[PDB]
Design an enzyme around this catalytic site. Structure first.
Site, PDB file in Angstrom:
ATOM      1  N   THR E   1     -36.356   0.897   4.644  1.00 13.76           N
ATOM      2  CA  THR E   1     -35.305  -0.057   4.970  1.00 13.76           C
ATOM      3  C   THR E   1     -33.976   0.373   4.364  1.00 13.76           C
ATOM      4  OG1 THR E   1     -36.618  -2.064   5.362  1.00 13.76           O
ATOM      5  CG2 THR E   1     -34.419  -2.360   4.431  1.00 13.76           C
ATOM      6  N   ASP E  17     -31.051  -0.502   9.492  1.00 20.87           N
ATOM      7  CA  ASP E  17     -32.006   0.193  10.340  1.00 20.87           C
ATOM      8  C   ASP E  17     -32.973  -0.818  10.948  1.00 20.87           C
ATOM      9  OD1 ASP E  17     -33.348  -0.135   7.707  1.00 20.87           O
ATOM     10  OD2 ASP E  17     -34.967   0.973   8.683  1.00 20.87           O
ATOM     11  N   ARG E  19     -36.458  -0.265  11.612  1.00 20.28           N
ATOM     12  CA  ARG E  19     -37.856   0.115  11.456  1.00 20.28           C
ATOM     13  C   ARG E  19     -38.521  -0.764  10.406  1.00 20.28           C
ATOM     14  NH1 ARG E  19     -39.831   5.979   9.191  1.00 20.28           N
ATOM     15  NH2 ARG E  19     -39.488   6.613  11.364  1.00 20.28           N
ATOM     16  N   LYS E  33     -32.843  -6.912  11.201  1.00 23.09           N
ATOM     17  CA  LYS E  33     -32.735  -7.156   9.770  1.00 23.09           C
ATOM     18  C   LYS E  33     -31.410  -7.794   9.376  1.00 23.09           C
ATOM     19  CE  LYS E  33     -35.893  -3.391   8.692  1.00 23.09           C
ATOM     20  NZ  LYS E  33     -36.109  -2.110   7.970  1.00 23.09           N
ATOM     21  N   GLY E  47     -37.009  -6.698   0.788  1.00 22.10           N
ATOM     22  CA  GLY E  47     -38.050  -7.296  -0.025  1.00 22.10           C
ATOM     23  C   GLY E  47     -39.156  -7.907   0.808  1.00 22.10           C
ATOM     24  N   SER E 129     -35.034   0.915   0.442  1.00 24.16           N
ATOM     25  CA  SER E 129     -35.544   2.196  -0.032  1.00 24.16           C
ATOM     26  C   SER E 129     -34.609   3.352   0.294  1.00 24.16           C
ATOM     27  CB  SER E 129     -36.925   2.463   0.565  1.00 24.16           C
ATOM     28  OG  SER E 129     -36.894   2.379   1.979  1.00 24.16           O
ATOM     29  N   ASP E 166     -34.912   8.835   4.186  1.00 23.32           N
ATOM     30  CA  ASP E 166     -35.916   7.936   3.638  1.00 23.32           C
ATOM     31  C   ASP E 166     -37.046   7.767   4.642  1.00 23.32           C
ATOM     32  OD1 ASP E 166     -37.323   5.949   2.185  1.00 23.32           O
ATOM     33  OD2 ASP E 166     -36.184   4.368   3.190  1.00 23.32           O
ATOM     34  N   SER E 169     -37.207   4.215   6.468  1.00 21.33           N
ATOM     35  CA  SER E 169     -36.164   3.861   7.417  1.00 21.33           C
ATOM     36  C   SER E 169     -36.252   4.758   8.643  1.00 21.33           C
ATOM     37  CB  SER E 169     -34.771   3.983   6.789  1.00 21.33           C
ATOM     38  OG  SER E 169     -34.771   3.514   5.454  1.00 21.33           O
TER      39      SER E 169
END
Lengths: 202, 117, 236, 241, 220, 201, 238, 213, 214, 65
Positions: E1, E17, E19, E33, E47, E129, E166, E169
């Protein structure tokens, strides 16, 4: 985190670094750790950010209501007492070391330390945070009675610069606040404005 | 000081089988300012009169027609502060319905809940 | 007319109205007589049967609080049920805590502490809304010897050498004053109690019209059987 | 008819008659007075001796609400004692919370709000007492407040509560208290108390005097026996001509 | 994320993102999101996803009630205070971390709120992340008082760095642009990733599956 | 601790040892492990002495209240059920009780085993305690429903004696009780040394 | 009228009638007398019997080793107050390991009894107490009222026909202070006898005596322990 | 962490005679390897006929003694008479079991006279399990003193010995000797021995010095 | 308090003919760090009682506030009764035991010194509710370093004068400074007599360091 | 902890432990719990002192490094 409050004749000088860390990652490098509780009362926050923020908000609320009720400027001792009561009643649930500094018509400049646990003591000067350990000897050997406001500002800036140089949890910019009868003067030291001490080599 | 209230009903049946407190509340409503509602083919119009007893009042400060949601509106006849209480409760009920079902409350459901209150 | 005042209002004479009304309610009950002698305590109550289809053995106006304590009740017996249960529970609690028997005075005090615990405001749900309508005669034998106690819904309790409660408590008490003396034996006490009951009862005294129980040093609470009652009423 | 049975009911005129009846109960009590001077507050109470069997100092109407605060009461003594307990609790809680002695104005406001809380419901009864609060501090000076059964609190220079408060007010108005000291104010209060007392109506009384100020170092206390005797002698000699 | 936001000269740009993963497996390739709070306030979440959803919904409902009562546009400080008090009184058991941005009478404001109840008011924030790659992009290229297009490009670059560096993501880039005069909910804003084209065909035809029993119910 | 009880044609025989231990230290050799709840009901102590004593005293109080209210003595099944329901409320909190409720009621001789874990089983012969295995073996070898009264006394005494011989937490003296139709009787209390002299000799 | 049924209703004259009715309830009880010397405090109570075959009701109760009370009024209210006082004294001895001062106990009693006089649905305590105690300040005689007011007394009498006893105490208060124990008890007995009609005389059946002092815990003399105090009492002067 | 308990030493001994009861204890209060004070007796007079001895955690001992005193006063008020030794024992058993899940770390021995005038001794475990005994040792040196009391008072493991009734003087001498031996071998016992003798003429206290090392 | 944060070191008490003397250093330690070097760990309760405490300083401040409020209330009553040192000791024991029984102890060990009715009082209360009286007291490391010397002097001389008691207290303070790593050379000495409670400080002990050349 | 009772008095084998009588001193109460390293500049290794061996503390309680 390094926080510092020094008392001079007309009032107090407060100082803090601006680094907030989550492990070894700096989440906020321009943090403002000097919190105005009233017009002439500030607080320095160390420890858990959420705990200190909540306690400062609650003390601001209570002190504002108290000052409105009494129609009188609040005492620095009263703000320190509210902080102490909140930090002692919840000493198992909170992680908050507070420095309360301000000016009073009845008492002048005042520095109160409320460390973790919830004790309250008035001091000529106070230092807190993880970076305060590295500057204990410096403030012990450097502080003297009768310093003016400018000398207090220079002393606080020097001590904060040394602590930020040595402590990994301290850094960023130096935020200074001088409180007296006329009002509160705030300034930010950054870049070359921060005191420099040359690294010993060879 | 004692925070307890009365635990007995103030509205009770009469020998003729009527709740006279409800009838007196209806009389209070009937003494209120006129209000009109008309359901058209493509909408509804709520209209009411708000004539202040003096020109010293601020016409733009207190509203007799109030929104409950983005699709529900209110207007009343009778006692203004009671209307304010019911408007607050209706808004709270609609927000609770949206929190539960994540869709705006139908008019009938909100009417039923306010009538229950 | 009965809701003009609360349950806890004083009269201009300094008396709670409800307590006085309960005292009045007592006088509608059947007569009960308790006599205390150096040999024990005897309790006698009129059963006051209303219909012959009724079973007199189901009327219990004398109860066993404990092996050494008995209770005679007059007034509203349904009100006396809870007081009797409280007395039994108190005696058992005292035995559990101290491994000994209660004194009659302490049991009477524990029961009397419930008399005025009534009121509308500042009361938990299930609290008493009115005083009890019963007078209790507590008779028992403890380390101080046989003892007789009287309790009324005012919460007052006193020791009595011989007392009568109920509808005919005035005439019986005057009769008790003459017959009773300190040197009286248990048999004399029982005979005098039955004589006074026969005098005050409307119907003729027999083995089913009355209850009679005794508590003596060394013997538990004992309710007389029909043959014992027949033997006692043989010659009066 | 029936508009005067509850504190939660207004009369057609717009009056709460239960509060007025409590004030009437206050008006039936003996007179207590309090005078603020330039360096303290002096309290004087005309304590009636109802029976000669009572000990001296029985049913005292002067209380120490705090180390620096005194209380002079009039009306029902049990209600006055409950209000003194309330004031003591308020002062103790203020010191526990904010860490310093409560200002007299704030304490008066808190106790007045507590008293006013009993003038709103049918479940409770308005207090049948009125009282004065006196205090002295270096920062705040001399302060004197009075609270009536309705919950109204005002600051005063000289206050009188009880059976004879208009005559006591007339006597007090003749005093230039703004420049006097506690030493003279004690004698003046004693003289006023002796003047307003009714010998024919009341058999006898004790003169209860207390003060707080610079002479007591900011502590409320009973006026010392020497000063009390001198004040009583001065009052008696002033009554005589 | 990866969720990020900046304050530009005339408002707020939020990025995220799309995902969502459950462990090391991608469960959703198009996840929203960026959460509505008020017509002028939006929120990015990280979270515990259910905690974030419920907290944002509750605060949005409370802000709607507040704005209905006051009759004014909601303030970002009100949402921040509500969120931080609610999070603090649960002592971090509600694991919701949020990037809160909006424009009100006082102008554009950007907040980062943490599950324990601590908030920071910053000109640019990152969370998730992939937050460190996006923060690197911001520290490399951010300048104060950017224009709307420059701010959108910077936020897209930060989200792209989070997506491509990452493992948590990926997928698309969603942008929310908030100003005092308009609101732009761009979903998707960029599509840097797509499924590879088929090289062949799978066997899936009628009658391939054996059936034991069949029951048909006709709906009138 | 070794407590046993068995039913036979002449009632219920209850026997127990009298040794109380604290760790490896013998605190008392004269513990009354048979609790006289009523003139018609008996209980046994195994596990926590304080727990068993307190809860069986509460049971005695409850039975007396029941007799006063109903004007009839409680039954063995009802008393055991009352004790089981009382101790089930504290299950898992650390209470350690193993008891036998013995008596005679309208259904004849009664014998129930109740433990703090929640078990409540009626049976013919029971043995509770740390030495219960040895007593079980001896009793089962010697038990019969048609035993004579003296034979039952000897069997109970011998079983408790063997249990004290093999168990380190069993010893002192053997207390013997006989539950009959008109109440129980305290048969005897024989020291383990005297039993050793009688049996080995 | 309409002002005499609730304790929360003031009258137009500034009075509460329920409190006065509870004071009447106190006046209905049998007379008791309390008086103190420099070293002792004595309670003498005139017990009453419901009938010739009934024991005389208890009037003097144990509160603590240094405090005892005599009651007049509703007996259940008296028992409630006595239990409250006993609990307060036990709490004082548990927390501070010292006897509770008598004045502070009386203040607690007044505070407790004031609350029911201001709340709807409650009633005043219909009992009046005479409290005899000894502490560091010496002996004390206290009187409590249903009005929740209390008095510190040199001597006091409450109950039926207590005015004559109060007059006698007024007469002999000047010499109450220097009397020894026997003289003080005789003075109290004479004051109590002043409440009795001429045909009635003080006997061992209707007299209860409670004494507390410097070296003497609170003790109650009821039936045969009263005879030494009764002996020496002269005939009624008429 | 935090420990709500501590062991403060102290041995309590009681011997019941035909017409007397003796309760004895040392006066040393300790914690760990240190001595809090050398004058802290463990014997408390409850009534004119009952004396209790409490050893173990000293705070629990103080609280329990105060609670027992309050309950005795409550009983005297409610029943117009003083508690008997057996009634005190039963009440103490209930009090100790009231804290079953957070026990009083107290070793309790009650010594006094019963209703027949005979000496009575009751020993208590911390959760209220008690029984009547003729002699009992409790505390830190209980394991040392109990077998010797069994041998000397109970005449156990002895043959051709008459079971002469125990007299006051012999019991006093035996108590002094056993406490001397305990002070020799137990590190928590010493600095004094306080003996309370309960007879029908009242309660008599006596003090005997022990070694201070 | 589960984890004490700022703590005080040993507190000493000693009875003499005419009153009691109590000594404690003016240091509050944050672990090993000497952080607050000018705090007072001795409080005056009333005119006849003084109190010194070891352990958590915040808990000591809370207890000081509560005890001061109690004294204020009792003086407000003005009925001639005042709390004795024994009464304060008993109340402190009750409070500490109540806190310990709730698993929320006040992390303190307090010394109560007093003089009332011509007799000296010296009382000890710990965080578990263990209380006793003794002619001399020493908490913390003073129980091992200061108590033996006081006990030796009292065994040779059971009754001490004020001067002898103060000299012995000074010697014990010097020993504590020598051997205790959480102590400081800046302490207060509080005395209670028939004249009241008198607190003196800051005071220092004369130290010898000639064994450094050996 | 040391207030265990009845575990071993009911069943010879099983998790529950304890005799018929509660006695902390007989159920592993620490009594005077002292660290073996007390009075030492360094902490002792685990298992340095075998149980049952005569051990003399190097210092009083509270001097553990």
């Amino acid at each position: 985190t390094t926080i510092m409050a020094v008392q001079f004749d007309g009032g107090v000088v407060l100082g803090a670094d601006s680094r907030t860390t989550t492990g070894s990652y700096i989440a906020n490098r321009v943090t403002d750790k000097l919190t105005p509780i009233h017009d002439r009362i500030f607080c320095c926050r160390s420890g858990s950010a959420a705990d200190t923020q909540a306690v400062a908000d609650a003390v601001t609320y209570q002190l504002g209501f108290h000052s409105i009720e009494l129609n009188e400027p609040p005492l620095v001792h009263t703000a320190a007492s509210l902080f102490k009561e909140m930090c002692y009643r919840y000493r198992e649930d909170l992680m908050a070391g507070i420095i309360i500094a301000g000016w009073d018509p009845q008492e002048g400049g005042q520095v109160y330390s409320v460390p973790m646990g919830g004790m309250m003591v008035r001091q000529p000067f106070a230092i807190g945070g993880s970076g305060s350990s590295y500057i204990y000897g410096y403030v012990d050997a450097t502080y003297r009675e009768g310093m003016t406001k400018e000398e207090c500002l220079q002393f606080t800036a020097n001590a904060l610069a040394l602590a930020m140089e040595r402590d990994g949890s301290s850094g960023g910019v130096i935020r200074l606040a001088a409180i007296a009868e006329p009002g509160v003067e705030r300034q930010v030291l950054l870049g070359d404005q921060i005191p420099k001490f040359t690294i010993a080599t060879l | 000081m004692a925070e307890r209230g009365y635990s007995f009903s103030l509205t009770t049946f009469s020998p003729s089988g009527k709740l006279v407190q409800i009838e007196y509340a209806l009389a209070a409503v009937a003494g209120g300012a006129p209000s009109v509602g008309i359901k058209a083919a493509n909408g509804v119009v709520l209209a009411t009169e708000k004539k202040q007893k003096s020109i010293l009042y601020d016409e733009r400060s207190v509203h007799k027609v109030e929104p409950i949601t983005k699709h529900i509106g209110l207007v009343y006849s009778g006692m203004g502060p009671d209307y304010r209480v019911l408007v607050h409760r209706a808004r709270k009920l609609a927000q609770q319905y949206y929190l539960v079902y994540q869709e705006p409350i139908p008019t009938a459901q909100l009417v039923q809940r306010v009538a229950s209150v | 007319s009965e809701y003009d005042r609360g349950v806890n209002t004083f009269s201009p004479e300094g008396r709670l109205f409800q307590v006085e009304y309960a005292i009045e309610a007592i006088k509608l009950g059947s007569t009960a007589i308790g006599i205390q002698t150096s040999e024990g305590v005897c309790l006698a109550v009129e059963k006051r049967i209303t219909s012959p289809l009724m079973e007199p053995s189901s009327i219990e106006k004398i109860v066993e609080i404990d092996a050494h304590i008995g209770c005679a009740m007059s007034g509203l017996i349904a009100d006396a049920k809870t007081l009797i249960d409280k007395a039994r529970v108190e005696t058992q609690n005292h035995w559990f805590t101290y491994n000994e028997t209660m004194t009659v005075e302490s049991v009477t005090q524990a029961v009397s502490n419930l008399a005025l615990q009534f009121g509308e405001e500042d009361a938990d749900p299930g609290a008493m809304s009115r005083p009890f309508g019963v007078a209790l005669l507590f008779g028992g034998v403890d380390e101080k010897g046989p003892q007789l106690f009287h309790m009324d819904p005012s919460g007052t309790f006193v020791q009595c050498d011989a007392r009568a409660i109920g509808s005919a408590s005035e005439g019986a008490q005057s009769s008790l004053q003459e017959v009773y003396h300190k040197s009286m034996t248990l048999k004399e006490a029982i005979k005098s109690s039955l004589i006074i009951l026969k005098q005050v009862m409307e119907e003729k005294l027999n083995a089913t019209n009355i209850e009679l129980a005794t508590v003596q040093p060394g013997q538990n609470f004992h309710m007389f059987t029909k043959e014992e009652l027949e033997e006692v009423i043989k010659d009066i | 008819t029936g508009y005067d049975l509850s504190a939660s009911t207004f009369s057609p005129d717009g009056r709460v008659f239960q509060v007025e009846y409590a004030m009437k109960a206050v008006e039936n009590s003996s007179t207590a007075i309090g005078i603020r001077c330039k360096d303290g507050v002096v309290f004087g109470v005309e304590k009636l001796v109802l029976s000669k069997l009572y000990e001296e100092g029985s049913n005292k109407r002067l209380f120490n609400v705090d180390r620096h605060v005194g209380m002079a009461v009039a009306g029902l003594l049990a209600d006055a004692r409950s209000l003194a307990d309330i004031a003591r609790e308020e002062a103790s809680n203020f010191r526990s919370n904010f860490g310093y002695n409560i200002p007299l104005k704030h304490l008066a406001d808190r106790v007045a709000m507590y008293v006013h809380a009993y003038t709103l419901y049918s479940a409770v009864r308005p207090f049948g007492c009125s009282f004065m609060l006196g205090s002295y501090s270096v920062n705040d000076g001399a302060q004197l407040y009075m609270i009536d059964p309705s919950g109204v609190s005002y600051g005063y220079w000289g206050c009188a509560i009880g059976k004879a408060r208009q005559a006591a007010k007339t006597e007090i108005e003749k005093l230039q208290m703004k420049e006097m000291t506690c030493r003279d104010v004690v004698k003046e209060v004693a003289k006023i108390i002796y003047i307003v007392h009714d010998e024919v109506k009341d058999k006898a009384f004790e003169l209860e005097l207390s003060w707080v100020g610079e002479i007591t170092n900011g502590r409320h206390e009973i006026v010392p026996k020497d000063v009390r005797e001198e004040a009583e002698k001065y009052a008696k000699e002033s009554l005589k001509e | 994320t990866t969720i990020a936001g900046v304050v530009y000269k005339d408002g707020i740009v939020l990025g995220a993102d799309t995902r969502a993963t459950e462990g090391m497996v991608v469960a959703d390739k198009n996840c929203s999101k960026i959460h509505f709070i008020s017509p002028n306030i939006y929120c990015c979440g990280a979270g515990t996803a259910a905690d974030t959803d419920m907290t944002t919904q509750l605060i949005s409902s409370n802000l709607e009630l507040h704005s209905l009562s006051t009759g004014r546009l909601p303030r970002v400080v009100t949402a921040n205070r509500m969120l931080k008090q609610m999070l603090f009184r649960y002592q971090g058991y509600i694991g919701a971390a949020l990037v809160l941005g909006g424009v009100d009478v006082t102008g554009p404001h950007l907040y980062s709120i943490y599950p324990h109840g601590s908030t920071d008011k910053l000109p640019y924030v990152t969370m998730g992340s992939g937050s460190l790659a996006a923060m690197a992009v911001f520290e490399d290229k951010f300048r104060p008082d950017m224009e709307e297009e420059e701010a959108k490009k910077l936020v897209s670059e930060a989200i792209a760095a989070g997506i491509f560096n990452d493992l948590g993501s990926g997928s698309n880039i969603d942008l929310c642009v908030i100003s005092k005069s308009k609101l732009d909910f761009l979903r998707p804003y960029s599509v840097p990733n797509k499924k590879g084209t088929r090289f062949g065909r799978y066997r899936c035809e009628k009658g391939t599956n054996a059936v034991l029993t069949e029951k048909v119910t006709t709906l009138e | 601790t070794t407590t046993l009880a068995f039913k036979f044609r002449h009632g219920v025989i209850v026997a127990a040892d009298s040794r109380a231990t604290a760790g490896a230290y013998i605190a008392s050799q004269t513990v009354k492990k048979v609790i006289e709840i009523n003139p018609y009901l008996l209980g046994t102590m195994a596990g926590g002495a304080a727990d068993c004593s307190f809860w069986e005293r509460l049971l005695a109080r409850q039975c007396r209240i029941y007799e006063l209210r109903n004007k009839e003595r409680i039954s063995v099944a009802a008393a055991s059920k009352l004790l089981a329901n009382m101790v089930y409320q504290y299950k898992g909190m650390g209470l350690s009780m193993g008891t036998m409720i013995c008596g005679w009621d309208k259904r004849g001789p009664g014998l129930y085993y109740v433990d703090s874990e929640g078990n409540r089983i009626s049976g013919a012969t029971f043995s509770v305690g740390s030495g219960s295995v040895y007593a079980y073996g001896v009793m089962d070898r010697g038990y019969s429903y048609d035993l004579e009264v003296e034979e039952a006394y000897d069997l109970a005494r011998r079983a408790i004696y063997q249990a004290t011989y093999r168990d380190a937490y069993s010893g002192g003296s053997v207390s013997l009780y006989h539950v009959r139709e008109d109440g129980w009787i305290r048969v005897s209390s024989d020291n383990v040394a005297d039993l050793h002299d009688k049996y080995s000799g | 009228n309409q002002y005499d049924n609730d304790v929360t209703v003031w009258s137009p004259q500034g009075r509460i009638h329920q409190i006065e009715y509870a004071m009447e309830a106190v006046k209905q009880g049998s007379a008791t007398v309390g008086l103190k010397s420099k070293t002792h405090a004595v309670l003498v109570a005139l017990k009453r019997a419901q009938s010739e075959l009934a024991a005389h009701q208890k009037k003097i109760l144990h509160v603590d080793n240094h405090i005892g009370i005599s009651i007049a009024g509703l007996t259940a209210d008296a028992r409630l107050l006595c239990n409250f006082m006993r609990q307060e004294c036990l709490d004082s001895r548990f927390v501070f390991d010292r006897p509770l001062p008598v004045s502070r106990l009386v203040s607690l009693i007044g505070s407790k009894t004031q609350i029911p006089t201001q709340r709807y649905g409650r009633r005043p305590y219909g009992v009046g107490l005479l409290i005899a105690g000894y502490d560091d300040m010496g002996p004390h005689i206290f009187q409590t009222c249903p009005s929740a007011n209390y008095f510190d007394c040199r001597a006091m009498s409450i109950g039926a026909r207590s005015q004559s006893a109060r007059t006698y105490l007024e007469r002999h208060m000047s010499e109450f202070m220097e009397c020894n124990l026997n003289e003080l008890v005789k003075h109290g007995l004479r004051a109590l006898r002043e409440t009795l009609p001429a045909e009635q005389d003080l006997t061992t059946k209707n007299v209860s005596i409670g004494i507390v002092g410097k070296d003497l815990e609170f003790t109650i003399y009821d039936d045969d322990d009263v005879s030494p105090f009764l002996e020496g009492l002269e005939e009624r002067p008429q | 962490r935090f420990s709500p308990y501590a062991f403060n030493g102290g041995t309590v001994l009681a011997i019941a005679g035909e017409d007397f009861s003796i309760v004895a204890s040392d006066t040393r209060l300790s914690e760990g390897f240190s001595i809090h004070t050398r004058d802290s007796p463990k014997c408390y007079k409850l009534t004119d006929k009952t004396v209790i001895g409490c050893s173990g955690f000293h705070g629990d001992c103080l609280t329990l003694t105060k609670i027992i005193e309050a309950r005795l006063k409550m009983y005297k008020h409610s029943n117009n008479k003083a508690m008997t030794t057996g009634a005190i024992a039963a009440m103490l058993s209930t009090i100790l079991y009231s804290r079953r899940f957070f026990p009083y770390y107290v070793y309790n021995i009650i010594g006094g006279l019963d209703e027949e005038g005979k000496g009575a001794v009751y020993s208590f475990d911390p959760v209220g399990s008690y029984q009547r005994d003729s002699f009992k040792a409790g505390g830190s040196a209980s394991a040392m003193l109990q077998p010797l009391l069994d041998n000397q008072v109970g005449f156990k493991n002895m043959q051709n010995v008459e079971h002469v009734p125990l007299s006051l003087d012999r019991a006093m001498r035996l108590v002094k000797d056993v406490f001397i031996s305990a002070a020799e071998r137990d590190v928590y016992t010493g600095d004094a021995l306080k003996v309370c003798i309960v007879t029908k003429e009242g309660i008599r206290g006596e003090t005997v010095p022990l070694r201070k090392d | 308090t589960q984890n004490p944060m700022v703590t005080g070191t040993s507190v000493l008490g000693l009875k003499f003919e005419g009153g009691v003397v109590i000594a404690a250093d003016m240091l509050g330690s944050y672990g090993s760090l000497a952080r607050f070097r000018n705090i007072s760990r001795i409080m005056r309760v009333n005119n006849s009682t003084m109190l010194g405490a070891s352990g958590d300083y915040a808990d000591f401040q809370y207890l000081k506030q509560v005890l001061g409020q109690m004294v204020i209330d009792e003086e407000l009553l003005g009925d001639g009764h005042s709390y004795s040192p024994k009464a304060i000791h008993s109340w402190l024991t009750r409070a500490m035991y109540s806190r310990r029984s709730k698993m929320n102890p006040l992390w303190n060990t307090m010394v109560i010194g007093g003089y009332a009715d011509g007799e000296s009082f010296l009382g000890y209360v710990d965080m578990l509710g263990v209380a006793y009286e003794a002619p001399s007291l020493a908490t913390g490391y003073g129980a091992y370093l200061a108590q033996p010397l006081l006990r030796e002097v009292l065994e040779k001389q059971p009754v001490l004068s004020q001067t002898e008691a103060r000299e012995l207290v000074e010697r014990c303070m010097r020993v504590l400074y020598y051997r205790d790593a959480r102590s400081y050379n800046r302490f207060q000495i509080a005395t209670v007599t028939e004249k009241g409670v008198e607190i003196e400080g800051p005071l220092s002990a004369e130290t010898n360091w000639d064994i450094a050349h050996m | 902890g040391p207030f265990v009772v009845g575990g071993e008095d009911l069943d010879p084998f099983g998790p529950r432990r304890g005799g018929m009588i509660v006695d902390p001193l007989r159920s592993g109460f620490p009594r005077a719990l002292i660290d073996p390293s007390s009075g030492l500049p360094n902490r002792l290794p685990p298992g340095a002192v075998p149980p049952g061996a005569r051990f003399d503390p190097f210092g009083p309680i509270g001097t553990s490094p």
